[PDB]
A paper describes a structure:
X-ray diffraction measurements were initially performed on crystals obtained from MtKARI purified and crystallised without any additional ions or substrates. The refinement and electron density quality was hampered by merohedral twinning, with a very high fraction (0.32); however, the model was complete and was refined to a 2.1-Å resolution. The overall conformation of the enzyme fits the well-characterised close state. In the obtained close state of MtKARI, NADP and Mg2+ are bound in the structure, even though we did not add any ligands in the crystallisation and soaking solutions. They therefore were natively co-purified from the cells of M. thermolithotrophicus. The structure of MtKARI in the close state harbours NADPH or NADP+ (later mentioned as NADP for convenience) bound to the Rossmann domain, as well as two metals coordinated at the Mg2+ binding site in structurally characterised homologs. While the NADP has a proper fit in the electron density, the suspected Mg2+ ions have a lower occupancy, especially for the second site, which might come from the twinning or a rather loose hexacoordination for the second site (site B). The first Mg2+ (site A) is hexacoordinated by Glu195, Asp191 and four waters, while the second ion (site B) is coordinated by Asp191, Glu231 and four water molecules with a far distant interaction with Glu227. The Arg48 and Ser53 selectively accommodate and stabilise the 2′-phosphate of NADP in the close state, similar to what is observed in SlaeKARI; however, the second stabilising serine (Ser61 in SlaeKARI) does not exist in MtKARI. A hydrophobic pocket contains the adenine moiety, several hydrogen bonds bind the pyrophosphate to the protein backbone and the ribose-nicotinamide part is bound by Asp83, Gly134 and a water network.
Residue numbers in the entry:
A (entry chain A), B (entry chain A), C (entry chain A), D (entry chain A): 2 to 329
Write the structure that this text describes.
């Protein structure tokens, strides 16, 4: 296990190579803007009737058609949603793949689960930032970066690891640290994390706490500040110092209450479920569920989106974030 | 209930008829090679850019395009995977179906569940061997055959039962015995058998026994011989003599231990599940699940294939079968 | 862990030695006939008022009285049922044991559990085939052999390991592979295997599946072919290629159904019982039960034998195996 | 199903034949005394150092040694305890068995479970009274008889059914009715009956009722009369008229209370246990337990005998039966 950083990487194997960034969404716009910041030879490939095309053009980028970018570039960096990467690849990318070319991703989903089968003679690597695309850029602008994983699925030029290292440094991931792993290990840990802790866990944790107080009769305005707003100020301490830096800044009264009560909230029942969530990922049951959600038309997902927006927490949340000027 | 054999069947209604065997896979190559052995007028219809096409050509068969074989033949025997039979039929078979033609299968899945709707005026029968395709041929080469079922879903020439009987004898199924049944009864018993006993049951049974000993600290090499390898030598006894022939050859110590302990392994809980497995088949819930696995891209199935290959039993299993020369 | 084979064994330490095979039952007749095939100096010791005595005499063997064979031979190979070995040894074998002689078995039951206490100055080894006696011979006739374990409990001539190796090669076990272990490990794994998987497991598995379909209203004749007869053709694939060779020959429909349903048949409850079955063996509770079954007159065992023979599966099983000529 | 009676049986096949009654216990003395009453040619075979020998001699019988009686008689009727019949048969009966002789029992235990294996050429029948031996005689003296079963396990003279019929009529069983059945069906129903209802059931039923009242504080003397003594006067009604004759003589208050409360005493739990008790008999588990009780020395049985005699019900029971003169 070796953690690559700035002093251990170079831009040698990308010095002289054109990189097509297919996409300009969360990560797409983020990574593309950063790569260009480092003085990297980048071309963005977008839809000509799509919205992001006008957005990448205003940002000062060489917007081109996906096919045109695909035919010109040496490296093809695919930054569109996973659920539609299989179609876009087979129709607007696969044809312009010549032996010696490199196909790179930021998530091993489509490769690992077999939705994209690359042709022989082509490099398959991954450069994956472990943060939301908006953070990836903002963290780069401040002079820092976000953690990144490097992976090689197919090495044909014998040059693949260096190529991915070069791109990782450009995106800024080398500032926080870069570790080499496999597509399988990146995809499985990423899905579990987002499901059990990063997106699923915290939201339900905050929701359960907010509604415990509201249904007890306390003000919804107070409940927001105490279960949701104050959370942002706490996690910063962990990010910079871990649990010890947080326990020291917080009062001893808060330290004793949290240490004794937390085993009761995250119980053994929740620990049992986290093990099952991981097994559904490992054996492809979640992927099957997610692929069928898309083929079915996202009725379940869209309905869940609508119910989330009708939560009182989001109403009182939005009203407080606007008056103080935290949300426009 | 009448069990047809060699002395009760004839090749009369197939004497003068061309038979298209669509496919050359497990059963495809098996049944086609046997039918020709009996001096039957067979044509194989394969893909021209596919692999099996070169394989059927080397075997000394009249390889032709599916459409060409379909237009020339009187009988169309479909031996490709069920999940893709619906598309191949509607595009490369249905057009060359003329009134008086016969459409035959070896499994009632696509017919019974409605994925293939034949046109009026056409015979619909089934000739189904109750064994893996590799065994179907090897059993024929030894001078024996495997059990077969005969079924008629649509009789238009009044000749359908004789046609299926003729083909069944050619494949060699008449040596072991042929019983007439319905598509529904063939499909439901076949799926249950393979799921609850033939493929699902034994594998999990062997796995649970292997890992009981390994985790107890005994050698994985010894555990293979005692839970898996010795199983092949035991089932032969049942195949030839049933439970009594096996109980007599095995020691009294093995007879008393198995008779008293087996109710504990296959318990009432497992008996309850076998009843539910059968009801999921009977009401089309398994078929719906299997059709969606394919539309979804087989991510779950392929992931299960990968986890199976990483089992220690398969590693130590493969190493012992190679050194002794049982697997090349 | 070293796996002995043909190229790693020799007949040196048995070249010049007489071997008494006490017994002519399943293993007795099997091993004795094979040892003689290899040009080994074998004498069979049987009862003069017993049936097998006439059977070994017809086979072209030097039938002699157990005592006579015991007094003449250097090696005494005991191939009679375990439950009666203790009496036969103390009365017709122990007296003719001279220092320097070797006492060999094919199962560690009587030695490990203390029912036979050998005298000092005598070699105690084991040559154990991991297959039913009928298979041991048939496998030898085909040019192959069955797996064997080698064990040394007492080495007095410093020659014991070579002696057992010599006999193992003669029986044909060296063709499949020979591994050295202890009496304890041979006896405990053998009993567990036969109880939980080889004899107990499969029979109850097949029974539960057969009766699920029959009580659902499907034909008993069809149920036999689909839960029992087709099993023999499936295990062959595992024997030669493991789970992967079987999954590939079977259809994808059978592969998906078995992979998803098997966890439900062999459940956690069955896994818990397999752990208890192993602990009853390890602490001598099964042996105590089996010894008391014999002292009590085998009323329970014989009653279980009678109920097994009245199963409908065995009736319909026997009728189908006779008409096709698989059972005379 | 034909119920033999007095008008359907004859003493033809026993007219001219000597019958050895081995034993003079409960049934032994009972059946022997009755057979002689009918003018039957009976010899009793007892131990010469045993007690019953002096008792049969005083009763006016031809007491002889078991061997002497065995060598003289044509029919050998074995009326000793089942647990010791196997030894007495092989040592004092088997030698005097000549082809054409008949071996008869009153219980199928030793035959059915294989503790006595008769020689070929000898008749094996059963004449079984369904009542305690004391009742068998007393019922005969009153001019009535007790129900009997007739069974044939081996017919060698073609005369076996007539022989058993002849003896059944002599014992008096033909007055109540004689039904032909198998050894298996006689033994299994007899053991279940005595275990679940006739001896086990009623005693525990009476015990539970007696101690319910005593521990509630009511007089033990009153509790005896109301739960135990009055039972004898109730069953007579059922014996002569069934449930309807009893319900009519008893008060409507007793009829309504018993009809509504009885489902609560004999519940579903007891019904589940009766099914298991029958399965332990059917598969020989009870027989194995009972054979081991004897080999072990009857310590458990004798201890249960001692605890029964220390019950307060038996103390207060005995005191009331003596003062009134019902027990000497
Ligand atoms: N999102 C994260 O924070 C995050 C974190 C780590 C890794 N990743 C991975 O990074 C990759 C990029 O995901 P993302 O969330 O950033 O994507 P995204 O925002 O969901 O995708 C938006 C972009 O995709 C384009 N697009 C959508 N459908 C298209 C189609 N049919 N043809 C062509 N272009 C199409 C859009 O163009 P138009 O304007 O024309 O519609 C737009 O440029 C994924 O593999 C994801 O797993 C994401
Ligand atoms: N497998 C058994 O042991 C078994 C037992 C009883 C009954 N059955 C039944 O027998 C039938 C045959 O199954 P199977 O397992 O033997 O088939 P299979 O081996 O899975 O199918 C392989 C064959 O299908 C061809 N094929 C695949 N996709 C095709 C496509 N899109 N167009 C044209 N040809 C295509 C392949 O040709 P290429 O070389 O060109 O790819 C190859 O010849 C099924 O209905 C099954 O349920 C099977
Ligand atoms: N059976 C297997 O497949 C298997 C697999 C591995 C290991 N083993 C082990 O191999 C050993 C041999 O078992 P086995 O099953 O092959 O034996 P078996 O068939 O049950 O024994 C039959 C033989 O024992 C003789 N015999 C029975 N009672 C006798 C007595 N009182 N005195 C003398 N000879 C007597 C019989 O002679 P008569 O003809 O005179 O009656 C006959 O020759 C055991 O230790 C067993 O655990 C067996
Ligand atoms: N008991 C019933 O009500 C009843 C109901 C139906 C059927 N049966 C069946 O009828 C049969 C007779 O049973 P039972 O209860 O009447 O017998 P039992 O009273 O228990 O046996 C007593 C008799 O057995 C003799 N005896 C005991 N041990 C002996 C030995 N070692 N050698 C020779 N004689 C010996 C005694 O002779 P000594 O005086 O010398 O000791 C005495 O004559 C059994 O098969 C039973 O199952 C009984
Ligand atoms: Mg992530
Ligand atoms: Mg993600
Ligand atoms: Mg099948
Ligand atoms: Mg199938
Ligand atoms: Mg074994
Ligand atoms: Mg064994
Ligand atoms: Mg009785
Ligand atoms: Mg009784």
């Amino acid at each position: 296990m070796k953690v690559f950083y700035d002093s251990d990487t170079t831009f040698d194997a990308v010095k002289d190579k054109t990189i097509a960034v297919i996409g300009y969404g969360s990560q797409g716009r983020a990574q593309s803007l950063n790569m260009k910041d480092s003085g990297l030879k980048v071309v963005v490939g977008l839809r000509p009737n799509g919205a992001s095309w006008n957005k990448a053009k205003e940002d000062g980028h060489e917007v081109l058609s996906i096919e045109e970018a695909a035919e010109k570039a040496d490296i093809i960096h695919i930054l569109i949603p996973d659920e539609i990467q299989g179609d876009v690849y087979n129709k607007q990318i696969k044809p312009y793949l010549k032996e010696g070319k490199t196909l790179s991703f930021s998530h091993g989903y489509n490769i690992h689960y077999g939705y994209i089968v690359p042709p022989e003679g082509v490099n398959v690597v991954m450069v994956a930032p472990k943060s939301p695309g908006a953070m990836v850029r903002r963290t780069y602008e401040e002079g820092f970066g976000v953690p990144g994983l490097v992976c090689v699925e197919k090495d044909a030029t014998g040059d693949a690891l260096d190529i991915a290292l070069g791109m990782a440094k450009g995106v800024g991931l080398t500032r926080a640290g870069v570790i080499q792993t496999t597509f399988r290990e990146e995809t499985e840990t990423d899905l579990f994390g987002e499901q059990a802790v990063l997106c699923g866990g915290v939201t339900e944790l905050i929701k359960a706490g907010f509604e415990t107080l509201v249904e007890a009769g306390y003000s919804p305005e107070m409940a927001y500040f105490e279960t949701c707003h104050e959370l942002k100020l706490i996690i910063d301490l962990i990010y910079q110092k871990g649990f010890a830096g947080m326990w020291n800044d917080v009062s001893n009264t808060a330290e004793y209450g949290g240490l004794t009560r937390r085993s009761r909230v995250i119980n053994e029942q929740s620990r049992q479920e986290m093990r099952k969530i991981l097994k559904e990922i490992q054996d492809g049951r979640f992927t099957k569920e997610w692929a069928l959600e898309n083929i079915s038309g996202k009725a379940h997902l869209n309905s869940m989106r609508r119910i989330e927006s009708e939560l009182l927490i989001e109403e009182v949340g939005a009203k407080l974030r606007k008056m103080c000027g935290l949300q426009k």
